[PDB]
Design a protein around this ligand. Structure first.
Ligand SMILES: CCCCCCCCCCCCO[C@@H]1O[C@H](CO)[C@@H](O[C@H]2O[C@H](CO)[C@@H](O)[C@H](O)[C@H]2O)[C@H](O)[C@H]1O
Ligand SMILES: CCCCCCCCCCCCO[C@@H]1O[C@H](CO)[C@@H](O[C@H]2O[C@H](CO)[C@@H](O)[C@H](O)[C@H]2O)[C@H](O)[C@H]1O
Ligand SMILES: CCCCCCCCCCCCO[C@@H]1O[C@H](CO)[C@@H](O[C@H]2O[C@H](CO)[C@@H](O)[C@H](O)[C@H]2O)[C@H](O)[C@H]1O
Ligand SMILES: [Zn+2]
Lengths: 453, 453
């Protein structure tokens, strides 16, 4: 029919999918701590392990979509599988193996969904795909803004009208019906727009490969769940992945991909900072920020700590037209990040009563997410001048980011915000210095970049 | 004889002039504070006012040499005049007006000396005026290394075998015989190499203009001494020079020199940091650094605080071959300066007994002088794509650097190093952050400099 309409339909189902995902993510760490009983260094570790799993998932899921089931049918199967993930997260049980399974299913289902939705935009436009992708990208941010703005307060609201359960589970149900929404959306527009796109979708579904792909999926859910439950297992598996990427690198001309080596170590650093906002900045928000947001000197409104993360896509959309108006922008990325961290770093020496900051979150997220904005060029074709080595590197860096968040973990018997503030600002300051170390590294590695050219 | 020997003589007489000068500088703030009774916020202001004067002096002096007296005879005359400056500084009196005159004389005499020695370096080579000038720069650094290592130690030694005066005046006498040394050098070589160079030096010396410039020079010493002694005077004329450069800029195609504007405001900041090392870091060294230097883990040796500043040219020599082996190099400069300030910033939370660091000076100074090195592109030809506006902004920034240095001034009645440590590391840490803002400014202003091209 057109390329814009199927770019539309794929961007819509994308949008609702991410709605579900990020709504879920903000609440997931606060859940592991506040409703489940987890201390915060387990909370970080489990979340980061599940994060790395999630980030490194679309490798296999993509290969399954491209060459085994259809790209569309795989994308759909992902959609169903995560409708079921959130569905699980919705049953009111305080048993971790249940939640851990639910997270396992989201890992599997996500690996099946997103490389294939992205792949379909990519097939819809043959070039203009980058514009397409940026448009695509913005769909993401909008969905996730609303999701994150929404889900915590559903939990808040419900935890207020009823006792502790659901509340959280209500929110996870919101996620679920977000996925479901995106699915009805997809059907109608299924044939409406999607029509031509995929490769092994041109022939009828090989039910043995469907079977075996399902079986292996459930297995992956169990494997995931045993990675999440047992910290030491996950840590070993991450470490193995580490010695693996070091293998691939140390046996893989020298100037261009010692430049590539440097590039992905700098990728890893960047992701550690990025991981900081699910985890350490989240707990600092929960523990040390006046949730009363005043526009000096009005009142409204009053944050729910989780909602702070919505400032991320918000600022992205906000700064997206401004930037509309050369690996030196890594340097800039890192520098601006450094300054975000220093903003939280001096969340202490100004506007403090123990629990006080508020605007520290806003400007922090501006600086940080701006940094993210100036590095949307970390595709691997950009260390070309291999999906595996870098994707695993990057997953490994999600987990690592969780352990750094653990460099600022607070005891559960320590509830005096007056004493927890220092711990968080100490982390944040040494990250800000780290981000400047990293800016130095970037700018210093730019001579190798025009010795290759 | 050859152009290499006349580059040789001008570099030799240069080296010794700079010898006298920097021996004097290190010792000058410690003098105003320890032997004179000045508190450090006066010591900072007075030394910084003298600094700005010194830096903008070579304007008049360069033109006097080019267009009124000879370039050779003006350089020489500058030399005599600073023989007399340091000579003055050596007479043992605690008289403020006395010293201030001595400094006035150093200003006059410098303005006559350095622009002309440098000018004739530039006539000796007719593109390897660049090779010549970097060699020249190295001659400078080595000389100032000798003096900075020597004179403080003289001051200590003589202050030990005799009572309070000389010690210091002894050190300044050392400077004076440094100038005198360089002068004998020049005599011999007077005719030997220097021979041809200058414009109004080809005809016999016009004694009306000799008499009138000497007279105006005496005046320059009185105007100087009164700008230094009375702090408020200096601050008024500094302010005046301020409204002047702000004028000239904002009534003085727009994109390239709004970029030039940005470039010189970052030069201005840069000079503030660099001034931090005569001042706040010097006092910090004198007050909160274990002067016993240990190379893990024997004893040798034991510093004199002033001698710490010798680390500046030392590292320059040490790292200048390293760099032997793109105004983003301004960005990098700022970033590296930044971690220098963070090294001193966490000179406390590391290695502390009250008065403790030692290596902090070394690594900090390593970092600073690396930054200085990587920004040798602050020629005014680098904001072409104006001697005055840039020079005056730059002097004004010497003084400003003095007032920031003052953001860490300590009461004279406060001698508990345990309390003086925080004041200094707080200055230093937030300078480091400011320096990351400047890294961000520079990288951010690089699109303007590729729109000029
Ligand atoms: C339909 C298109 C999407 C439009 C953009 C997205 C809309 C956002 C939906 C959710 C936003 C609401 O989520 C936010 O949560 C906090 C606290 O939990 C609420 O805070 C509220 O509860 C507390 C507790 O009684 C009150 O004292 C407070 O005055 C009140 O503001 C806010 O009312 C709300 O701003
Ligand atoms: C492709 C689609 C995939 C969809 C898969 C969805 C299925 C998910 C199943 C969720 C059920 C989890 O089931 C869970 O099993 C574990 C065993 O490890 C039990 O484990 C339990 O017993 C042991 C006894 O020693 C306790 O110490 C432990 O703390 C406790 O959690 C849980 O009580 C049970 O609730
Ligand atoms: C041409 C290149 C020039 C670069 C090198 C120039 C050489 C240096 C010139 C003079 C060096 C003196 O600089 C240094 O100062 C300190 C402190 O006063 C001295 O310290 C000395 O006196 C003190 C006090 O009794 C002792 O504790 C110490 O053990 C002893 O070494 C050292 O003797 C010296 O190492
Ligand atoms: Zn800091």
């Amino acid at each position: 029919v057109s390329k814009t309409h199927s770019f539309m339909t794929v961007s819509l189902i994308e949008l609702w999918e991410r709605f579900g995902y990020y709504g879920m993510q903000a609440l997931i760490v606060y859940f592991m701590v506040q409703r489940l009983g987890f201390d915060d260094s387990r909370a970080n570790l489990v979340w980061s392990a599940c994060a790395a799993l999630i980030y490194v998932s679309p490798a296999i899921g993509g290969w399954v979509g491209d060459k085994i089931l259809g790209t569309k049918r795989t994308m759909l199967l992902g959609a169903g599988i995560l409708s079921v993930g959130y569905a699980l997260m919705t049953v009111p049980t305080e048993n971790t193996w249940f939640m851990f399974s639910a997270l396992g299913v989201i890992v599997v289902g996500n690996g099946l969904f997103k490389p294939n939705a992205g792949n379909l935009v990519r097939k819809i436009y043959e070039s203009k795909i980058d514009s397409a992708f940026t448009i695509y990208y913005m769909a993401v941010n909008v969905g996730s803004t609303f999701s994150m703005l929404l889900t915590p307060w559903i939990k808040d609201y419900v935890n207020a009208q009823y006792g502790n359960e659901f509340g959280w589970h209500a929110a996870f149900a919101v996620c679920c019906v977000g996925i479901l929404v995106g699915l009805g959306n997809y059907a109608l527009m299924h044939k409406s727009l999607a029509n031509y796109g995929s490769e092994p979708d041109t022939r009828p579904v090989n039910k043995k490969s469907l079977a075996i792909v399902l079986a292996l999926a459930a297995l992956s859910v169990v494997a995931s769940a045993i990675i999440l439950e047992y910290e030491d297992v996950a840590r070993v598996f991450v470490y193995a992945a580490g010695v693996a990427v070091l293998g691939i690198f140390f046996h893989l001309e020298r100037a261009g991909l010692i430049a590539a080596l440097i590039l992905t170590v700098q990728t890893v650093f960047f992701f550690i900072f990025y991981q900081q906002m699910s985890t350490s900045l989240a707990l600092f928000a929960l523990r040390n920020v006046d949730w009363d947001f005043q526009v000096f000197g009005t009142h409204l409104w009053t944050w729910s700590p989780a909602q702070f993360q919505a400032l991320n896509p918000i600022w992205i959309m906000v700064l997206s037209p401004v930037l509309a108006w050369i690996a030196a922008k890594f340097a800039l990325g890192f520098a601006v990040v450094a300054i975000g961290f220093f903003i939280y770093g001096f969340a202490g020496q100004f506007a403090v009563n123990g629990k006080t900051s508020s605007w520290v979150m806003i400007w922090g997220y501006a600086s940080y997410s701006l940094g993210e904005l100036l590095v949307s060029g970390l595709g691997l074709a950009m260390i070309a001048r291999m999906m595996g080595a870098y994707f695993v590197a990057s997953g490994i860096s999600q987990y690592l980011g969780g352990v750094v968040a653990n460099f600022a973990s607070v005891p559960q018997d320590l509830v005096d915000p007056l004493q927890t503030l220092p711990v968080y600002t100490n982390l944040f300051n040494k990250l800000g210095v780290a981000a400047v170390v990293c800016t130095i590294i970037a700018l210093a590695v730019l001579p190798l970049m025009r010795r290759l050219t």
